[PDB]
C-alpha cells in the first residue's frame, strides 16, 4: 500500500519511458534514445536516494515493525524496478 504509492512515481516514469522509447524509435531515435536513457538514470537516482532514506528510517528508532515493513516493502519495490530500469536500459541501449 504505502510502499507502492511511494514508488508509483517511478512506475509512471517506467510507463512513460517505455512509451518514449517506442515513440522515439518511430519518431527519430537520433539522440532522444540516449537522452531518454539518461532520464531513467535520473529516475534511478532519486529513487535510490529515497531508498537510502528508508534505510535511514530503519535506523531512526522512531519506527515500528510496521514502518520497518514499509521500508522493507519499499526497498524491495524500488530495488526490483531499479533493476528493471537498468534492464530496460540495456535493452534500449542495445537497440542503439
From Swiss-Prot:
Known outcome of mutating residue 32 to A: Over 20% reduction in IgE-binding
Coiled-coil region list: none
Consequence the record notes for mutating residue 62 to A: Over 20% reduction in IgE-binding. Further reduction in IgE-binding. Most significant reduction in IgE-binding
Keyword annotations from UniProtKB, A to Z: Allergen, Signal
The UniProt record lists the keyword Aminoacyl-tRNA synthetase: no
Subunit details: May exist as homodimer and homotrimer.
Protein name in the entry: Mite allergen Blo t 21
Residues of the full protein shown: 34 to 129 of 129
Amino acid at each position: 500500500n504505502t510502499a507502492t504509492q511511494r514508488f508509483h512515481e517511478i512506475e509512471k516514469f517506467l510507463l512513460h519511458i517505455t512509451h518514449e522509447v517506442d515513440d522515439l524509435e518511430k519518431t527519430g531515435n537520433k539522440d532522444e534514445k540516449a537522452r531518454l536513457l539518461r532520464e531513467l538514470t535520473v529516475s534511478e537516482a532519486f529513487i535510490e536516494g529515497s531508498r537510502g532514506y528508508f534505510q535511514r528510517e530503519l535506523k531512526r528508532t522512531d519506527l515500528d515493525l510496521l514502518e520497518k515493513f514499509n521500508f522493507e516493502a519499499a526497498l524491495a519495490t524500488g530495488d526490483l524496478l531499479l533493476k528493471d530500469l537498468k534492464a530496460l536500459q540495456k535493452r534500449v541501449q542495445d537497440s542503439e
